[PDB]
Amino acid sequence: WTILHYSPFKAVWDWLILLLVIYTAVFTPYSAAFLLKCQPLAVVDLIVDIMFIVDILINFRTTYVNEVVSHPGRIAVHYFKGWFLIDMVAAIPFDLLIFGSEELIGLLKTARLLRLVRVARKLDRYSEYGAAVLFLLMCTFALIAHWLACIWYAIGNMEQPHMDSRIGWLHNLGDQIGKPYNSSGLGGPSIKDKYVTALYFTFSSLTSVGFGNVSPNTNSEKIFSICVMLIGSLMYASIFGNVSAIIQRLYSGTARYHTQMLRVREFIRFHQIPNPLRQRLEEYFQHAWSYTN
Amino acid sequence: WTILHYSPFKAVWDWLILLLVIYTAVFTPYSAAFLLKCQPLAVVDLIVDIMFIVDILINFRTTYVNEVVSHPGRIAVHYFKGWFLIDMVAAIPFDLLIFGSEELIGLLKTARLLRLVRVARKLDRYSEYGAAVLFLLMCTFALIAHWLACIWYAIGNMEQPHMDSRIGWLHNLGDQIGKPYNSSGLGGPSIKDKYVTALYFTFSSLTSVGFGNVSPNTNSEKIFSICVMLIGSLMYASIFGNVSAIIQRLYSGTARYHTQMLRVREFIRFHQIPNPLRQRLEEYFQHAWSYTN
Amino acid sequence: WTILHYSPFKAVWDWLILLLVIYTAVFTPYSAAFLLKCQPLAVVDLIVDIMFIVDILINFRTTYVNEVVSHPGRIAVHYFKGWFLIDMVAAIPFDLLIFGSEELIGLLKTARLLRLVRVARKLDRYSEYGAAVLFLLMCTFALIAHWLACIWYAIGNMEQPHMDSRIGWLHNLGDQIGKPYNSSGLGGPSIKDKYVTALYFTFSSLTSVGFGNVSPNTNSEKIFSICVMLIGSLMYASIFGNVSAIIQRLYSGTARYHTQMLRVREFIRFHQIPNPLRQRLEEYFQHAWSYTN
Amino acid sequence: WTILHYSPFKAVWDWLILLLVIYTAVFTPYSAAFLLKCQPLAVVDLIVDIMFIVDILINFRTTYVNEVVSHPGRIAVHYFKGWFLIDMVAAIPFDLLIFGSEELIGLLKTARLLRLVRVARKLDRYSEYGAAVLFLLMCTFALIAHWLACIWYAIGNMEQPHMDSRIGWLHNLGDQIGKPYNSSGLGGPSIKDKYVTALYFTFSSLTSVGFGNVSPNTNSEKIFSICVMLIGSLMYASIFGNVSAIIQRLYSGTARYHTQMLRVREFIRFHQIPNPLRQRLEEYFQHAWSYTN
């Protein structure tokens, strides 16, 4: 058998794998930052890993254009020359292969972030619709804010148990919500308080509003904020440049319509057109425009 | 009888109903957030509800285009197939029908916010003039800031009387203005202090300036700010994209004029035109431009 | 005698009166806000008032276009029908006519701000050059920041001596710089400290950065900040829209040059042009472009 | 001998001198602000000064266009009439010529900042590639942030040892990180803490996010922030206007492609083209576009 790459099955499968790549982009950075020391999430994480291996089999059994190539040997060799390496490294189950704690293993499972490359390949499918690229651009913004929230928590959590003298952002969070840290590192804020504060601070940093309660005090926190001010300004020159451009592209029929209507209105004023003729001019423009766009 | 939809009466009535929809958009969210436990506002609220019912009768008696249809049966059936459902639900007097406190009834009167749909329909009338769409866009910005101020006060007021341990924004407001809360929830800021601080914080959040005195500390306050940072950035890519585009559209005659004037100026420099001819060139451009735009 | 409106004298006089209007726009709001209870400023203020009266005489003796009109009666009648009223009210010496303190008289001298209308008239002269409209736009931004700094100090100074209980921005300034207010309103910050802090806060508010040390606490201070967030966002959609557009207009020769150069570069790549011909193509474009712009 | 200005040697040498100008732009302001009272930096600083003198010799031995001029006398005279003065003053070793402390001498070595003019000349080379002008624009932004960080530290360090009464930004930094100043000016933050805080504050000021921990309190600090709010807004109207324009220029093939594809898609919808013809239309557009761009 062989799947045609343009078929309605392969279209639905590629949009299903977009949602599983978004699951990887959320829960892999989160587990590596917040959770390092069956459940519904533990079985879902296995189901998703199985579907990312099934997608390797579909890539051995899909046609390609280089009109179409359909021979299984020329398909398999094209994948082995192309993306099979990255798609395989994104699937190696290192948790079953290494023993050196669950911290090393859970950090090594960040190799799953190579699944973002499956979305970077298939942009010919995903970018075709204006409403789909608006969904992509807002998910890219919300995922950059989330990955930075995981890095910001790693910077806090790698300094809170140190000889910090109560300066870093996690001690200040403990004081600000009335959940202070004891000297042994016991007590303190919950994982919900620490995650919600980290995500709040990185949306605050990226959108460039500082409400004054979370702020960087250690040199590592300040160097992280210098980097997020560089990222946030390149990202606003790119993402929110493109988001407004796609909104203005969706609005483009109406933007042209107002422009041509005002040219007709000024022509009507300049020639001082009488009402029995004027109605025929402006009703003709409405008929012609609604007919042809 | 039957109203022509293009008549000067129906034009004035549609602009009158825009101002009554703005009254609904201000005073319905405000009453549901700040006031839940005759006066000039109580009689005005009844007068406005009566005029929104009269508008249902005008919709049973207005022509429509599908050239015009004027038969009262084809008018009435078109409205029953179309918007009559939403226009009726926006007019059901639930305060006269339900008994379960004045809190439930006052919250249920938020069904009046369906009147915003009357403005979403009639955009063919309201968007025709550049100065009118500037008035709409600044009212949309000021109303989003006000609706968010009502949600932010609901988030504060649903946590201030809880076992909060004096963390949320209303306790901090009480301390900052020297009107502290007693343990029983007595004393505290006035409704003017709480409304002005809520509206100040949501214009602060939407325009992305944090002056440092109001800030989100509870997880619900931080999740609200994460949402207002997403809303504010999509809204600036849309509203303030469009506001500058309409200002640049109003300026477009002058923007073209400077561009053509500088082309003529560079042509005059490049050919080194003598003054007796140069004056005739640049005065001709001024005459021709002021004649034709 | 009669001045030709296009003469090199009238050109120099109109640019001199722009600088005297900027003096009025700075020192009239400043004196009315900060100074209300000879010196170099007192004699300069008289010299400037004399030159704004001389400009009324020049307006009785200047030609106008309605080709030119040069008859002194048709000049004088055109000015009496036009701007003479506003130009006269901008020159009435109320300090010599009224007695009711120096506070009323100094506030009434704000009638001099009508001199801003002389700049609003003569925009045909002042907007002709791209570098001059950049100077205007940055002076409009710096003057809006200064007028708002005078309003913000009036809001502070009308509440500091009240039964405020040490909440408003001037008490907090006194504490922050170690110059606290005594209970009698004695001590406190200097006029330099109060002006520099007011101007700092309004550039902070207009550019939407809040560094956290100055913040609005009273309802009047918060309502002022709600207004400056509305002004600042309309102003950025207008002034900094136009400033970037004028910078991009000054850059337009280079922006076209890169665009045409890259079209020629892609044509050269697509046809795979040999070097002996390629040099002639790209050197011709450099010669033709530097010849014609 | 004589170097051809277009040769692959002179191309590599001009890109090497760009990296040595960036070294000067970083380490000269840093040494003059932070370090004023062999090592790897002391020998690198001598090596760089030698290479900037070798570049004067290359300028005496390079052809120029005024087709090319290659005569060594006409080359040398063109350089003596042109840039030789500034290139020589950028190389005078004042440290070997003056004795009046190492503070005066180290401040006088800021004459090396004239090397930025070598980059301002050669923009015909450096601006040719879109990825190179993105590297320039982000280095200009990061260097403006660094030069302002050196000025901000000079403003702090010229007031910290004064009769300040613990108001200025360096005393507040000492308190915020638990490294307070003793009355003699001993103790306090390290040069890493002071530099990282100064650079953090100027990226914070330029990108218009104030996180609330560093803020200007003295009049000199507030006047510096008024200036950085003026610089940052002109710079965002220029640098981040241009950075988005170059990103949109790099994207321009794809932006045209989506626009033409949607015109073809709307033509196909409007004429209701049957599938056997539709495939030939849209595959032809893909073939023609991938052939010609």
Tab-separated table of C-alpha atoms in Angstrom, chain C:
chain	number	residue	atom	x	y	z
C	1	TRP	CA	4.428	100.164	1.761
C	2	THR	CA	3.435	96.433	1.511
C	3	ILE	CA	5.309	93.143	2.218
C	4	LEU	CA	5.048	90.371	-0.426
C	5	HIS	CA	4.014	87.176	1.462
C	6	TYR	CA	6.596	85.057	-0.485
C	7	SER	CA	9.535	87.526	0.061
C	8	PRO	CA	12.754	86.410	1.883
C	9	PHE	CA	11.895	88.914	4.687
C	10	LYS	CA	8.438	87.348	5.288
C	11	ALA	CA	9.998	83.855	5.137
C	12	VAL	CA	12.598	84.773	7.850
C	13	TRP	CA	9.911	86.574	9.940
C	14	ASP	CA	7.564	83.538	9.877
C	15	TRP	CA	10.440	81.235	11.018
C	16	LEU	CA	11.339	83.791	13.761
C	17	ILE	CA	7.687	83.823	14.966
C	18	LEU	CA	7.774	79.964	15.116
C	19	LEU	CA	10.582	80.221	17.732
C	20	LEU	CA	8.635	82.908	19.682
C	21	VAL	CA	5.498	80.663	19.650
C	22	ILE	CA	7.668	77.851	21.110
C	23	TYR	CA	8.820	80.319	23.854
C	24	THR	CA	5.097	81.031	24.614
C	25	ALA	CA	4.254	77.289	24.603
C	26	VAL	CA	7.037	76.623	27.200
C	27	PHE	CA	6.994	79.623	29.558
C	28	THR	CA	3.256	80.524	29.735
C	29	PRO	CA	2.068	77.066	31.055
C	30	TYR	CA	5.140	76.877	33.323
C	31	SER	CA	4.497	80.296	34.938
C	32	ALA	CA	0.750	79.579	35.388
C	33	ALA	CA	1.392	76.168	37.091
C	34	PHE	CA	4.699	76.503	39.024
C	35	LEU	CA	5.252	80.251	39.741
C	36	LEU	CA	1.850	81.683	40.911
C	37	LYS	CA	2.275	82.960	44.530
C	38	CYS	CA	14.039	93.693	35.934
C	39	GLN	CA	14.897	89.942	35.707
C	40	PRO	CA	16.241	88.534	32.347
C	41	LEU	CA	13.032	86.474	31.852
C	42	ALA	CA	10.761	89.466	32.746
C	43	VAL	CA	12.377	91.679	30.033
C	44	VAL	CA	12.433	88.762	27.490
C	45	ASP	CA	8.699	88.196	28.150
C	46	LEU	CA	8.030	91.895	27.329
C	47	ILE	CA	10.260	91.803	24.182
C	48	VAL	CA	8.335	88.721	22.941
C	49	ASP	CA	4.933	90.387	23.626
C	50	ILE	CA	6.108	93.448	21.608
C	51	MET	CA	7.170	91.231	18.641
C	52	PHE	CA	3.753	89.469	18.671
C	53	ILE	CA	2.122	92.966	18.384
C	54	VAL	CA	4.531	93.947	15.521
C	55	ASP	CA	3.347	90.753	13.739
C	56	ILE	CA	-0.249	92.197	13.812
C	57	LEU	CA	1.087	95.275	11.929
C	58	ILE	CA	2.878	93.001	9.384
C	59	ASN	CA	-0.484	91.195	8.884
C	60	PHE	CA	-2.111	94.604	8.050
C	61	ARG	CA	0.739	95.178	5.489
C	62	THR	CA	1.169	91.747	3.761
C	63	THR	CA	-0.186	90.677	0.342
C	64	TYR	CA	-2.413	87.548	0.068
C	65	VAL	CA	-3.811	85.179	-2.661
C	66	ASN	CA	-7.609	84.928	-3.169
C	67	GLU	CA	-2.784	85.842	-8.145
C	68	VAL	CA	-1.893	88.301	-5.293
C	69	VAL	CA	-4.002	91.093	-3.743
C	70	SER	CA	-1.894	94.172	-2.808
C	71	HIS	CA	-4.439	96.965	-2.017
C	72	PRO	CA	-4.036	98.027	1.694
C	73	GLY	CA	-7.838	98.303	2.210
C	74	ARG	CA	-8.462	94.768	0.796
C	75	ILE	CA	-5.536	93.487	2.960
C	76	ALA	CA	-6.885	95.147	6.147
C	77	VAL	CA	-10.516	94.025	5.535
C	78	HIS	CA	-9.336	90.433	4.806
C	79	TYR	CA	-7.487	90.373	8.166
C	80	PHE	CA	-10.479	91.906	10.098
C	81	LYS	CA	-12.799	89.244	8.515
C	82	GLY	CA	-10.158	86.542	9.226
C	83	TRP	CA	-7.695	86.062	12.101
C	84	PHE	CA	-7.439	89.633	13.563
C	85	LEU	CA	-9.809	88.769	16.468
C	86	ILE	CA	-7.710	85.797	17.725
C	87	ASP	CA	-4.432	87.675	17.042
C	88	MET	CA	-5.750	90.637	19.119
C	89	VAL	CA	-7.030	88.468	22.056
C	90	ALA	CA	-3.552	86.797	22.048
C	91	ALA	CA	-2.148	90.361	22.710
C	92	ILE	CA	-4.610	92.023	25.230
C	93	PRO	CA	-2.414	92.992	28.272
C	94	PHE	CA	-4.866	91.868	31.044
C	95	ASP	CA	-2.095	92.393	33.702
C	96	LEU	CA	-2.433	96.178	32.978
C	97	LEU	CA	-6.304	96.052	32.991
C	98	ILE	CA	-7.352	93.948	36.082
C	99	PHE	CA	-6.664	94.201	39.875
C	100	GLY	CA	-8.447	89.426	42.110
C	101	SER	CA	-4.788	88.655	43.062
C	102	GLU	CA	-1.657	88.008	40.930
C	103	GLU	CA	-2.976	84.380	40.838
C	104	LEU	CA	-6.070	85.416	38.765
C	105	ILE	CA	-3.954	87.735	36.567
C	106	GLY	CA	-1.201	85.107	36.026
C	107	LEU	CA	-3.830	82.457	35.181
C	108	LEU	CA	-5.551	84.939	32.775
C	109	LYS	CA	-2.184	85.445	30.926
C	110	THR	CA	-2.757	81.859	29.615
C	111	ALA	CA	-4.730	83.692	26.839
C	112	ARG	CA	-1.239	83.985	25.175
C	113	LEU	CA	-1.588	80.262	24.226
C	114	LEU	CA	-3.777	81.511	21.308
C	115	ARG	CA	-0.358	82.240	19.622
C	116	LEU	CA	-0.195	78.462	18.827
C	117	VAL	CA	-2.882	79.280	16.167
C	118	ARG	CA	-0.261	81.344	14.176
C	119	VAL	CA	1.649	78.047	13.682
C	120	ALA	CA	-1.601	76.153	12.870
C	121	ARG	CA	-2.303	78.718	10.043
C	122	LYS	CA	1.153	78.856	8.392
C	123	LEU	CA	1.587	75.059	7.899
C	124	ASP	CA	1.998	75.691	4.125
C	125	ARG	CA	5.383	77.314	5.019
C	126	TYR	CA	6.444	75.142	7.963
C	127	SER	CA	5.579	71.659	6.530
C	128	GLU	CA	7.401	72.160	3.164
C	129	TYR	CA	10.720	70.550	4.305
C	130	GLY	CA	11.041	66.976	5.706
C	131	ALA	CA	13.683	67.998	8.303
C	132	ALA	CA	11.466	70.924	9.465
C	133	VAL	CA	8.389	68.680	10.013
C	134	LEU	CA	10.642	66.285	12.041
C	135	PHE	CA	11.598	69.313	14.211
C	136	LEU	CA	7.870	70.237	14.525
C	137	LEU	CA	6.764	66.654	15.429
C	138	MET	CA	9.434	66.256	18.167
C	139	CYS	CA	8.597	69.747	19.535
C	140	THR	CA	4.858	68.803	19.554
C	141	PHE	CA	5.731	65.626	21.539
C	142	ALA	CA	8.007	67.515	23.993
C	143	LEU	CA	5.379	70.325	24.398
C	144	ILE	CA	2.498	67.840	25.037
C	145	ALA	CA	4.750	66.226	27.705
C	146	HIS	CA	5.421	69.728	29.218
C	147	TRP	CA	1.751	70.899	29.196
C	148	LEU	CA	0.750	67.610	30.859
C	149	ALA	CA	3.579	68.164	33.427
C	150	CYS	CA	1.965	71.539	34.307
C	151	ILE	CA	-1.525	69.930	34.633
C	152	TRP	CA	-0.046	67.075	36.763
C	153	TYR	CA	1.634	69.618	39.063
C	154	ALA	CA	-1.644	71.596	39.334
C	155	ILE	CA	-3.435	68.323	40.367
C	156	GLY	CA	-0.667	67.619	42.950
C	157	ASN	CA	-0.399	71.186	44.298
C	158	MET	CA	-4.229	71.587	44.618
C	159	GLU	CA	-4.274	68.460	46.900
C	160	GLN	CA	-0.942	68.575	48.855
C	161	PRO	CA	-2.178	71.447	51.195
C	162	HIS	CA	-5.639	69.761	51.575
C	163	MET	CA	-6.674	67.167	54.236
C	164	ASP	CA	-4.920	64.556	52.025
C	165	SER	CA	-3.406	62.357	54.832
C	166	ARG	CA	-0.066	62.145	52.875
C	167	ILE	CA	-1.317	60.113	49.834
C	168	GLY	CA	-0.724	62.361	46.761
C	169	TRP	CA	2.366	62.416	44.518
C	170	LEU	CA	4.052	65.476	46.119
C	171	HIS	CA	4.154	63.931	49.638
C	172	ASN	CA	5.616	60.724	48.148
C	173	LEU	CA	8.229	62.807	46.234
C	174	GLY	CA	9.208	64.529	49.530
C	175	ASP	CA	9.793	61.121	51.181
C	176	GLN	CA	11.596	59.581	48.136
C	177	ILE	CA	14.280	62.348	47.886
C	178	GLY	CA	14.663	62.955	51.669
C	179	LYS	CA	12.988	66.434	51.531
C	180	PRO	CA	9.760	65.640	53.491
C	181	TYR	CA	6.876	68.095	54.003
C	182	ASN	CA	6.228	69.512	57.490
C	183	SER	CA	2.535	69.587	58.630
C	184	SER	CA	2.292	73.369	57.835
C	185	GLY	CA	3.255	72.619	54.151
C	186	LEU	CA	6.806	73.987	54.823
C	187	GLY	CA	10.019	72.175	53.788
C	188	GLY	CA	9.251	69.755	50.919
C	189	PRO	CA	10.893	69.458	47.438
C	190	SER	CA	12.201	72.492	45.431
C	191	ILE	CA	10.589	73.829	42.184
C	192	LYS	CA	13.387	72.021	40.228
C	193	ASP	CA	12.591	68.697	41.991
C	194	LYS	CA	8.807	69.147	41.398
C	195	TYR	CA	9.141	70.219	37.744
C	196	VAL	CA	11.728	67.522	36.827
C	197	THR	CA	9.554	64.845	38.526
C	198	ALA	CA	6.382	66.083	36.760
C	199	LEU	CA	8.079	66.102	33.308
C	200	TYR	CA	9.679	62.702	34.021
C	201	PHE	CA	6.250	61.254	34.930
C	202	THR	CA	4.555	62.586	31.742
C	203	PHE	CA	7.305	61.320	29.379
C	204	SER	CA	7.065	58.038	31.381
C	205	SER	CA	3.237	58.019	30.897
C	206	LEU	CA	3.289	59.016	27.167
C	207	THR	CA	6.037	56.512	26.175
C	208	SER	CA	4.252	53.896	28.399
C	209	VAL	CA	7.175	52.990	30.741
C	210	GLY	CA	6.405	53.046	34.487
C	211	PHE	CA	9.647	52.759	36.529
C	212	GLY	CA	7.577	52.445	39.743
C	213	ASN	CA	8.697	55.455	41.851
C	214	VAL	CA	6.067	58.021	40.669
C	215	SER	CA	2.505	56.627	40.538
C	216	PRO	CA	-1.081	58.035	40.706
C	217	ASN	CA	-2.865	57.318	44.061
C	218	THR	CA	-5.702	59.896	44.417
C	219	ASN	CA	-8.793	59.583	42.156
C	220	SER	CA	-7.852	62.846	40.354
C	221	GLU	CA	-4.310	61.490	39.721
C	222	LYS	CA	-5.782	58.169	38.417
C	223	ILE	CA	-8.319	59.988	36.147
C	224	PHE	CA	-5.425	62.129	34.831
C	225	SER	CA	-3.480	58.906	34.039
C	226	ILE	CA	-6.572	57.374	32.305
C	227	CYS	CA	-6.664	60.538	30.116
C	228	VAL	CA	-2.862	60.473	29.418
C	229	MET	CA	-3.152	56.764	28.397
C	230	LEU	CA	-5.906	57.778	25.882
C	231	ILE	CA	-3.869	60.848	24.662
C	232	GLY	CA	-0.579	58.870	24.495
C	233	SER	CA	-2.100	56.052	22.367
C	234	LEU	CA	-3.826	58.452	19.875
C	235	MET	CA	-0.603	60.515	19.811
C	236	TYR	CA	1.571	57.402	19.069
C	237	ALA	CA	-0.892	56.352	16.291
C	238	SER	CA	-0.391	59.931	14.863
C	239	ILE	CA	2.986	61.612	15.818
C	240	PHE	CA	5.203	58.469	15.865
C	241	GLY	CA	3.280	57.106	12.843
C	242	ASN	CA	4.176	60.369	11.000
C	243	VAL	CA	7.801	60.571	12.386
C	244	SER	CA	8.555	57.064	11.045
C	245	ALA	CA	6.741	57.919	7.756
C	246	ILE	CA	8.918	61.100	7.323
C	247	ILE	CA	12.117	59.106	8.179
C	248	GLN	CA	10.996	56.480	5.577
C	249	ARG	CA	10.245	59.373	3.101
C	250	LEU	CA	13.806	60.755	3.624
C	251	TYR	CA	15.076	57.138	3.163
C	252	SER	CA	12.800	56.560	0.073
C	253	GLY	CA	15.559	57.008	-2.589
C	254	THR	CA	17.660	54.321	-0.804
C	255	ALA	CA	14.569	52.093	-0.212
C	256	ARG	CA	13.754	52.208	-3.979
C	257	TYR	CA	17.490	51.720	-4.801
C	258	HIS	CA	17.746	48.461	-2.747
C	259	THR	CA	14.436	47.227	-4.270
C	260	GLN	CA	15.515	47.871	-7.901
C	261	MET	CA	19.057	46.547	-7.174
C	262	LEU	CA	17.588	43.251	-5.849
C	263	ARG	CA	15.290	42.976	-8.949
C	264	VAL	CA	18.421	43.404	-11.149
C	265	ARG	CA	20.322	40.883	-8.921
C	266	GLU	CA	17.539	38.274	-9.247
C	267	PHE	CA	17.326	38.889	-13.045
C	268	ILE	CA	21.135	38.338	-13.232
C	269	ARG	CA	20.814	35.073	-11.187
C	270	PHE	CA	17.779	33.795	-13.166
C	271	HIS	CA	19.421	34.351	-16.605
C	272	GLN	CA	22.874	33.311	-15.192
C	273	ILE	CA	24.527	36.362	-16.848
C	274	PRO	CA	28.327	35.955	-17.617
C	275	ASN	CA	30.691	38.352	-15.771
C	276	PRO	CA	31.749	40.556	-18.815
C	277	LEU	CA	28.036	41.323	-19.440
C	278	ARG	CA	27.010	41.305	-15.714
C	279	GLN	CA	29.422	44.146	-14.835
C	280	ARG	CA	27.925	46.273	-17.679
C	281	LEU	CA	24.370	45.567	-16.345
C	282	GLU	CA	25.054	46.464	-12.670
C	283	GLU	CA	27.411	49.420	-13.453
C	284	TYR	CA	24.740	50.742	-15.877
C	285	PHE	CA	22.130	50.594	-13.071
C	286	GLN	CA	24.543	52.491	-10.728
C	287	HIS	CA	25.211	55.151	-13.445
C	288	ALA	CA	21.523	55.518	-14.454
C	289	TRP	CA	20.350	55.676	-10.800
C	290	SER	CA	22.990	58.241	-9.705
C	291	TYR	CA	22.040	60.311	-12.820
C	292	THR	CA	18.169	60.310	-12.471
C	293	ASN	CA	17.376	59.211	-8.846
